[PDB]
Amino acid sequence: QQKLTSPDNNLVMTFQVDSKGAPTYELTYKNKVVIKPSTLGLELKKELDSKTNLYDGFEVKDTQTATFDETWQPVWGEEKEIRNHYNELAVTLYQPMNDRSIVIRFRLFNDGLGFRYEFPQQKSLNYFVIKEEHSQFGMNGDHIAFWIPGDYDTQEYDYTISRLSEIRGLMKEAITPNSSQTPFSQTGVQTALMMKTDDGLYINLHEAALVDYSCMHLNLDDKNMVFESWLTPDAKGDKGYMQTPCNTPWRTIIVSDDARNILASRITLNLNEPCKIADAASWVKPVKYIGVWWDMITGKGSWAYTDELTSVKLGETDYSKTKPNGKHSANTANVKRYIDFAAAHGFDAVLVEGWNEGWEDWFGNSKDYVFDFVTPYPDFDVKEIHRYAARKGIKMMMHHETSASVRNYERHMDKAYQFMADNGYNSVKSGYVGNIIPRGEHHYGQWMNNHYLYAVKKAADYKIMVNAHEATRPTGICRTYPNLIGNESARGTEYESFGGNKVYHTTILPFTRLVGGPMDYTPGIFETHCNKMNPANNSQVRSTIARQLALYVTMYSPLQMAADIPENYERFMDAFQFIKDVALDWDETNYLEAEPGEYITIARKAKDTDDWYVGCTAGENGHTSKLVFDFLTPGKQYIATVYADAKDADWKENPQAYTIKKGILTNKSKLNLHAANGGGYAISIKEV
Amino acid sequence: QQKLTSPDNNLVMTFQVDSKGAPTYELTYKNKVVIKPSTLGLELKKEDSKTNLYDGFEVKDTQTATFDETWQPVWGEEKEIRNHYNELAVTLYQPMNDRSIVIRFRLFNDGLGFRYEFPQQKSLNYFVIKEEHSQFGMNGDHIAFWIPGDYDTQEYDYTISRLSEIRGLMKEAITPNSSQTPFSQTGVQTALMMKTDDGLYINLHEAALVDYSCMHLNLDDKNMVFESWLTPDAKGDKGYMQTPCNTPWRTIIVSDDARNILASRITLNLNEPCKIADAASWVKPVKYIGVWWDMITGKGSWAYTDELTSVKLGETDYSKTKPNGKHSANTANVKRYIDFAAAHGFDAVLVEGWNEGWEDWFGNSKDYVFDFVTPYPDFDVKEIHRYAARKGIKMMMHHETSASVRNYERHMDKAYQFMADNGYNSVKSGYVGNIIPRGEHHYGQWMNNHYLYAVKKAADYKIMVNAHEATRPTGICRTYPNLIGNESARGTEYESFGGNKVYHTTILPFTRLVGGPMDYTPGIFETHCNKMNPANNSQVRSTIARQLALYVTMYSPLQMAADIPENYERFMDAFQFIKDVALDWDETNYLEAEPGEYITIARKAKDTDDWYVGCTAGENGHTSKLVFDFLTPGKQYIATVYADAKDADWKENPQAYTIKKGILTNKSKLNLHAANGGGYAISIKEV
Ligand SMILES: [Ca+2]
Ligand SMILES: [Ca+2]
Measured CA to CA, the distance from residue A229 to residue A497 in angstroms comes to 34
* Cα B267 to Cα B249: distance, rounded to the nearest angstrom: 9
The H or E element containing residue A665 is strand A658-665
- Laid out side by side, the sheet with B126-132 consists of B52-53, B42-44, B126-132, B240-242
The CB density around residue B435, as the number of other CB atoms within 10 Å, is: 26
Alpha carbon distance B268, B513 (integer Å): 11
Tabulate helix, strand, coil % of chain A (nearest 5). Answer: 20, 35, 45
Residue among B240, B365, B440 whose CB faces A368 most closely: B240
A488 is in an annotated binding site: yes
Phi, psi of B106 (to 5 degrees): -120, 125
Go through the domains of chain B in sequence order and give each one's CATH number.
Answer: 1-269 (2.70.98.10), 270-687 (3.20.20.70)
**B125 has a chain A CB within 8 A of its CB:** yes
Residues 308 to 327 of B: which have CB under 8 A from any A CB?
309-310, 312
How many whole angstroms separate alpha carbon A16 and alpha carbon A37?
Answer: 9
Closest to A503 measured CA to CA, from A647, A646, A259, A680: A680
**SS3 call for A342:** helix
Distance CA B443, CA B275 (A): 24
Residue A422, C-beta contacts closer than 8 angstroms, at least 6 positions apart: none
> Helices B331-343 and B381-390 meet at what angle, rounded to 10?
10
Of the candidates A279, A269, A189, A345, the one whose C-alpha atom is nearest the C-alpha of residue A556 is A269
CB A469 within 8 A of CB A644: no
**B439 contacts in chain A (CB < 8 Å):** 234-236, 438, 440
Chain breaks in chain B (C to N over 2.5 A) after: 47
Residues B104 and B117: their CA atoms lie apart, in Å, by: 7
Alpha helices in A102-244 (DSSP H): 167-174
What are residue B604's DSSP bridge partners?
A: B587, B611
Number of helices (H), then strands (E), belonging to chain B: the values are: 12, 37
Which helix (H) or strand (E) covers residue B604, if one does? strand B598-605
Helix/strand/coil for A569: helix
Cis peptide before A438 (omega within 30 of 0): yes
Count other Cβ atoms within 10 Å, centred on residue B394.
20
Closest CA to B350 of B280, B267, B425, B455: B425
Q: What is the spatial distance between Cα A425 and Cα A191, in angstroms, rounded to a whole number?
A: 33
Chain A residues with CB inside 8 Å of B310's CB?
121, 126-127, 243-244
CB atoms within 10 A of CB A458: 17
Q: Are B248 and B114 in contact (CB under 8 A)?
A: no
Query: What span, in angstroms and rounded, lies between the C-alpha atoms of B574 and B637?
Result: 19
Contact yes or no for B432/B400 (Cβ under 8 A) = yes
| Catalytic residue (one of A78, A133, A494, A598) | A494
Which of B102, B111, B115 is CA-nearest to residue B272?
Answer: B115
Chain B residues with CB inside 8 Å of A129's CB?
Answer: 365
Torsion angles phi and psi, residue B76, rounded to 5 = 170, -165
B485 contacts B519 by C-beta, under 8 angstroms: yes
Cα A468 from Cα A486, distance rounded (Å): 6
Note the Cα A671 to chain centre separation in Å: 32
A121 CB-near residues (< 8 Å, 6+ apart): A244, A245, B309, B310
Nearest-by-Cβ selection for A310 from B122, B410, B413: B122
Cis peptide before B244 (omega within 30 of 0): yes
Residue A603 CA, distance from chain mean position: 20
Amino acid at A628: V
The one-letter code for the residue type at A10 is N
Q: Is A173 annotated in some ligand binding site?
A: no
Closest C-alpha to A370, from A397, A398, A399, A404: A404
Chain A residue closest to B233 (CA)? A439
- As to burial, measured by CB atoms within 10 angstroms (0-12 exposed, 13-18 middle, 19+ buried), residue A579 is buried
Identify the H or E element spanning A468. Answer: strand A465-468
Q: A257: helix, coil or strand?
A: coil
Measured over the CA atoms of residue A472, residue A477, residue A481 and residue A486, the dihedral's sign is positive
Q: Any long-range contacts for B278-281 (C-beta under 8 Å, 24+ apart)?
A: B279/B74, B279/B481, B279/B482, B280/B74
Contacts of B316 (CB under 8 A, 6+ apart): B308, B356
User: How many whole angstroms separate alpha carbon B409 and alpha carbon B429?
Assistant: 12
Q: Are A426 and A464 in contact (CB under 8 A)?
A: yes
Q: How many CA atoms lie within 13 A of A265 on its CB side?
A: 35
Secondary element (H or E) of residue A17:
strand A11-17
B222–chain A Cβ distance below 8 A for any pair? no
Please give the residue of chain B at the shortest CA–CA distance from A311: B125
Rounded CA-CA distance B140/A471 in Å is 58
Measured distance CA(B687)–CA(B684) in Å, rounded: 9
Give the distance (Å) from ligand 2 centre to CA of residue B569: 27
- For the residues of A38-105, what is the DSSP string, one character each? EE--EEEPP---GGGEESSS-EEEEEEEEEEEEEE--SSSSSS-EEEEEEEEEEEEEEGGGTEEEEEE
Told to judge if B409 belongs to the known catalytic residues of this protein, a careful annotator would answer no
- CA B596 vs CA A577, B195, B258, B619, B622: distances in Å: 87, 11, 11, 9, 12
Selecting from B234, B309, B410 the residue whose C-beta is nearest the C-beta of A126 gives B309
**Strand pairing category for B126-132 and B286-291:** unpaired
Q: Which residues contact B458 (CB under 8 A, 6 or more apart)?
A: B416, B427, B464, B465, B482
Q: Cα–Cα distances in Å, from A361 out to A321, A354, B236?
A: 17, 12, 24
Q: Residue A176 burial (CB < 10 Å; 0-12/13-18/19+)?
A: middle
Flag whether residue B439 sits within 8 Å of chain A, measured between CB atoms. yes
Instruction: Go through chain A and tell me how many residues it has.
Output: 688
Residue B437: name the closest of A558, A568, A73, A234 by CA. Answer: A234
* CA–CA separation, B11 and B4 (whole Å): 8
Do residues A476 and A271 make contact, with C-beta atoms less than 8 angstroms apart?
yes
Q: Classify B497 as helix, strand or coil.
A: coil
- Give the separation between CA A217 and CA A188, rounded to whole angstroms: 7
- CA nearest neighbour of A344 among A569, A96, A119, A157: A569
Q: Cβ of B309 and A123 within 8 Å?
A: yes
Contact A406, A398 (CB under 8 A): no
Please give the Cα distance from A644 to A658 (Å, whole number): 6
Handedness of CA A206, A478, A460, A483 (dihedral sign): positive
Q: Do B240 and A127 touch (CB under 8 A)?
A: no
Element containing residue A335 per DSSP (H, E): helix A332-344
B414: left (phi over 0), alpha (psi -120 to 50) or beta: alpha
B367 touches chain A (CB under 8 A): yes
Supply the DSSP string of A580-635, one letter for each residue: HH--SSEEEEEEEEEETTTEEEEEEEETTSS-EEEEEEE-TT-EEEEEE-TTSPTT
Out of A366, A367, A438, name the one closest to residue B437 (CB): A438
Residue A490 alpha carbon to ligand 1 centre in Å:
8
Name the CA radius of gyration of chain A, rounded.
25
A404: region left, alpha or beta (phi > 0 left; psi from -120 to 50 alpha): left
C-beta of residue A167 within 8 angstroms of C-beta of residue A147: yes
The answer to whether A342 and A360 have CB atoms below 8 angstroms apart is no
B176 is in an annotated binding site: yes
- State the pairing for strand pair B111-118/B426-430: unpaired
Instruction: Compute, in angstroms, the gap from residue B302 CA to the centroid of ligand 2.
Output: 15
Cα torsion A475, A480, A486, A492 to 10°: value is 0
Q: Tell which of A47, A363, A368, A461 to mutate to test the B interface (max B CBs under 10 Å).
A: A368
User: Breaks in chain A follow which residues, C to N over 2.5 Å?
Assistant: 47
CA distance A153 to chain B (A): 16
Nearest to A139 by CA among A255, A228, A35: A35
How far apart, in whole angstroms, are the C-alpha atoms of residue A602 and residue A606?
13
Tell me the C-alpha to C-alpha distance, in Å, between residue B369 and each of A481, B112, B310, B470: 24, 44, 11, 18
Report phi then psi at B538, rounded to 5: -70, 150
Q: How far apart, in whole angstroms, are the C-alpha atoms of residue A42 and residue B491? A: 43
- Quickly list DSSP for B217-263: EEEETTTTEEEEEEPP-TTS---EEESSEEPPEEEEEEESSHHHHHH
Contacts of A410 in chain B (CB under 8 A): 406, 409-410
Cα dihedral A662, A666, A667, A673, rounded to 10, equals -20
- The answer to whether residues A350 and A331 touch, using CB atoms and an 8 Å cutoff, is no
Q: Tell me whether residues B366 and A450 touch, CB distance under 8 A.
A: no
**How far does chain A reach from its first CA to its final CA, in angstroms?**
59
- Tell me the angle at which helices B445-460 and B405-421 cross, rounded to the nearest 10 degrees: 10
Enumerate long-range contacts of B272-279, CB under 8 Å, 24 or more apart.
B272/B208, B272/B478, B272/B479, B273/B71, B273/B478, B273/B479, B274/B74, B274/B478, B274/B479, B274/B480, B274/B481, B275/B479, B275/B480, B276/B459, B276/B480, B276/B481, B276/B482, B279/B74, B279/B481, B279/B482
Inter-residue contact B461 to B416 (CB < 8 Å): yes
List the one residue out of A23, A21, A91, A17 whose CA is nearest residue A50.
Answer: A21
Among B579, B582, B584, B567, which Cα is nearest to B524's?
B567
Q: CB neighbours of A449 closer than 8 A, spacing ≥ 6?
A: A210, A211, A212, A213, A214, A215, A472
Q: Return the bridge partners of B24, or none.
A: B16, B39
R_g of chain B, CA atoms, integer Å: 25
How many interchain CB pairs under 8 A, A with B?
Answer: 74
Measured between beta carbons, the chain A residues lying within 8 angstroms of B237 are 439
Q: What 3-state class would DSSP assign to A206?
A: strand
Strands A484-487 and A559-561: unpaired
Contacts of A485 (CB under 8 A, 6+ apart): A76, A284, A286, A287, A427, A465, A466, A467, A478, A518, A557, A558, A559
* Pairing status of strand B464-467 against strand B426-430: parallel
Strand, helix or coil for residue B555 = coil
Question: Could you tell me where the beta strands, DSSP code E, fall in B431-578?
Answer: 464-467, 483-486, 558-560
Query: Would you call A410 an interface residue with chain B, using a CB distance cutoff of 8 Å?
Result: yes
Of the listed B227, B352, B493, B495, which one is catalytic? B493
Residue B125 to residue A236, Cβ atoms within 8 A: no
For residue B449, the chain A residues in CB contact (below 8 A) are: 368
Residue ranges of alpha helices (H) inside A345-405 are: 382-391
